[PDB]
């Protein structure tokens, strides 16, 4: 396990840089901020009607009264202008404000914790989450647990002994063909059936699929021995 | 022999699980992996 | 997701009009912005509609006989005969839901065949393997010892089930019966979808209806008032038509990406239940279903999707 | 028929590819309009 972590980190690391888009969410957010930003600075470039974009001209050369309106244009349109950045900064900043939220609740449930809402971090039963600064933005590592190679088996609901059905205790009944195994659910480690590791749950009528084997008791052999 | 190509697209793989009555597949190895999450903060 | 629109400011603001291109190109890169954005909520509308039904990796299939402990799966199941493949609640979903001006609609990405195939894979994925196909590889499990699972999941012994497997299956039965005439008697059961649709479709008529707007000028239509007027005194009447329909276009962004904010997050909760509650058990409380969460089975519909929480 | 013009049928003064419509008209009636109040149907003056 501590080989496949390590390795997987290394792995982590090549991912990241080789990838074109790796960081493309927070690339975005810069690109739009600078392109936010870039597209209010050259609004001071448009007439919005006037008969000039530069304003030291416009007063200068023409009379007060005209130059009044012209202004009022070139006032309504940059007002206009800051009014819709504010606006889709107002926008995207809920967005962000949505995203780190987002990644507070990440930070909180994974970094702090370790999560049992599937897909919420990382692809696989979550094991840990590694914070990363970034700029402008967080980086999880989230270490998730993957199951990989998977054997079939036949399973039984239950298992009928002594004339009473026998539940799993914790795993599912298993055989490899002949003999009949508990095993934990995310992990092939077959046991010997055993009245600690299985509860009676009355008569072997009513299950439906239930198989007829034996289950070992633990306390026989210390009363004959 | 290399050109733009126009297809409908392929959702994935097609894995029918061998569902049975009395079929199951418990694991029997692990996979230690390690996912990326940005996010915008 | 909603309607993946797209605005072209040189056919709305003026038609055949020539001279409003020049009068549009000295008012600036607005028009760059307004492209920006709704191709921005277009991808946006892909993503969504991507991350919530494309979960799964591998398009599953059920197996051809379907008997699964007496649960009956038939309404959610795809139905072969009829050509869309769609199960007959996703029908009842779809039947139920229900301008050349430089507005265009642009389709879907994943058309509404392919979300009913990735509906079906989840379907299957969860009939066939349970939770385990959404953490890792699928594995095969029989559905009475899924639910058994499912069971143990909220506290309650497995033994339950398997003494009550034909009671659950025909309350379960039932409930899925129940599911189609409660959604057929109720227009309103699928109120969000179609308030989604009639928004898209309301903002589309106001902005269309804004062309016949005369915004101060003494003719709304662009031929009148630029042919009668000479070019000085009908220029600033254009131009007011133009800072007109052009505040329209503003708007309808805006309105646009506040409502694209608010079908993403409810996307992003869609995502989240699926993730949670079709590829889980999820023991958050009211998260999925009014009772202690059993499962849940997505289901297509026009621009959303359907969750049919099963609880105890 | 089948070809973008510009149509001018008694001063409507449109532009737009003319197509037969199977929608009938009522006698008194000379031009059609869809839910936008846009020209969405004419009636041929020569014809009917
Ligand atoms: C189990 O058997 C089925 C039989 O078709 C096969 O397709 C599947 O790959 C088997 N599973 C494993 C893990 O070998
Ligand atoms: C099943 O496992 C048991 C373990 O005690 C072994 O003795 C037996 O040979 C195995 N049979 C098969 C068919 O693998
Ligand atoms: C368990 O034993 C009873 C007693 O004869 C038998 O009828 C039954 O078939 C056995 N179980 C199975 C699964 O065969
Ligand atoms: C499961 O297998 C087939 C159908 O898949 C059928 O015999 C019956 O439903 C089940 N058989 C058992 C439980 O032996
Ligand atoms: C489990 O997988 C690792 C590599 O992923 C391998 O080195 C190891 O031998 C495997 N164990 C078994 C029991 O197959
Ligand atoms: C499922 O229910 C339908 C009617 O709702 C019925 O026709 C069908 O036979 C049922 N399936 C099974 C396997 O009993
Ligand atoms: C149109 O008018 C001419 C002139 O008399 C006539 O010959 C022709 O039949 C008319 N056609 C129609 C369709 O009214």
Same mark, same amino acid.
């Given at each position: ?10 792995? #982590? ?14 690339? $975005? ?28 001209? #416009?007063?200068?050369?023409? $009379? ?7 202004? $009022? ?9 800051? +009014? ?45 989450? !590694?914070? +990363? ?6 980086? !999880? ?11 079939? !088996? ?36 077959? +046991? ?24 070992? *008791? ?5 009363? *004959?021995? | ?41 | ?36 954005? @709704? ?23 059920? /197996? ?58 989840? @379907? ?22 899924? =639910? ?21 299956a025909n309350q379960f039965n039932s409930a899925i019966g129940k599911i189609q005439d409660?959604?057929?008697?109720? /227009? ?22 804004? @062309? ?61 239940? =699926? ?19 059993? =499962? ?7 621009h959303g999707v359907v969750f049919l929480h099963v609880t105890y | 028929k089948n070809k ?33 109040? &846009? ?7 020569? &014809?009917?």
């Open positions: 396990i501590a080989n496949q972590f390590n390795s997987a980190i290394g792995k #982590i690391q090549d991912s990241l840089s080789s990838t074109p888009s790796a960081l493309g969410k927070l690339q $975005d957010v810069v690109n739009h901020n600078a392109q936010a930003l870039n597209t209010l600075v050259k609004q001071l470039s448009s007439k919005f009607g006037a008969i000039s974009s530069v304003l030291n001209d #416009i007063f200068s050369r023409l $009379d007060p009264p005209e130059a009044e309106v012209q202004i $009022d244009r070139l006032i309504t349109g940059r007002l206009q202008s800051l +009014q819709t950045y504010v606006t889709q900064q107002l926008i995207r900043a809920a967005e962000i404000r949505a995203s780190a939220n987002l990644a507070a609740t990440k930070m909180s449930e994974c970094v702090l914790g370790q999560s049992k809402r599937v897909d919420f971090c990382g692809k696989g039963y979550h094991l840990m989450s !590694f914070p +990363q600064s970034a700029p402008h933005g967080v980086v !999880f590592l989230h270490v998730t647990y993957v199951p990989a190679q998977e054997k079939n !088996f036949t399973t039984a609901p239950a298992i009928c002994h002594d004339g009473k059905a026998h539940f799993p205790r914790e795993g599912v009944f298993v055989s490899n063909g002949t003999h009949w195994f508990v095993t934990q659910r995310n992990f092939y480690e077959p +046991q010997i059936i055993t009245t600690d590791n299985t509860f009676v749950s009355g008569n072997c009528d009513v299950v439906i699929g239930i198989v007829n084997n034996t289950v070992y *008791d633990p306390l026989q052999p210390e009363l *004959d021995s | 022999s290399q050109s733009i190509i126009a297809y409908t697209m392929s959702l994935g793989a097609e894995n029918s699980v061998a569902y049975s009555n009395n079929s199951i597949a418990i694991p029997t190895n692990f996979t230690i992996s390690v996912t990326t999450e940005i996010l915008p903060v | 997701s909603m309607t993946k629109t797209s605005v072209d400011c040189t056919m709305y603001i003026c038609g055949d009009s020539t001279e409003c291109s020049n009068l549009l190109l000295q008012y600036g890169s607005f028009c760059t912005q307004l492209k920006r954005a @709704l191709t921005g909520i277009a991808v946006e509308q892909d993503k969504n509609t991507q991350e919530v039904f494309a979960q799964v990796k591998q398009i599953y299939k059920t /197996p051809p006989i379907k008997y699964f402990g007496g649960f009956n799966f038939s309404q959610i199941l795809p139905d072969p005969s009829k050509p869309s493949k769609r199960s007959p609640i996703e029908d009842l979903l779809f039947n139920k839901v229900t301008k050349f001006k430089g507005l265009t609609v642009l389709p879907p990405l994943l058309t509404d065949e392919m979300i009913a195939q990735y509906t079906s894979a989840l @379907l299957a994925g969860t009939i066939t393997s349970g939770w385990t196909f959404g953490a890792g590889p699928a594995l095969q499990i029989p559905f009475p010892m899924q =639910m058994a699972y499912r069971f143990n999941g909220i506290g309650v012994t497995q033994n339950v089930l398997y003494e009550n497997q034909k009671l659950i409660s959604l057929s008697s109720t /227009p309103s059961a699928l109120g969000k979808l179609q308030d989604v649709v009639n928004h898209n479709a309301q903002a589309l008529n106001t902005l269309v209806k804004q @062309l016949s707007s005369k915004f101060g000028a003494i003719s709304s239509v662009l031929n009148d008032i630029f042919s009668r007027l000479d070019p000085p005194e009908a220029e600033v009447q254009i131009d007011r038509l133009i800072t007109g329909r052009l505040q329209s276009l503003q708007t309808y962004v805006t309105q646009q990406l506040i409502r694209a904010a608010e079908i993403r997050a409810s996307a992003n909760l869609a995502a989240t239940k =699926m993730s949670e509650c079709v590829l889980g058990q999820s023991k958050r409380v009211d998260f999925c279903g009014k009772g202690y969460h059993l =499962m849940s089975f997505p289901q297509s519909a026009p | 973008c013009v510009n149509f001018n049928f008694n001063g409507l003064k449109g532009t737009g590819v003319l197509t037969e419509s199977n929608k009938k008209f009522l006698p008194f009636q000379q031009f059609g309009r869809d839910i936008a109040d &846009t020209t969405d149907a004419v009636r041929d003056p020569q &014809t009917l």
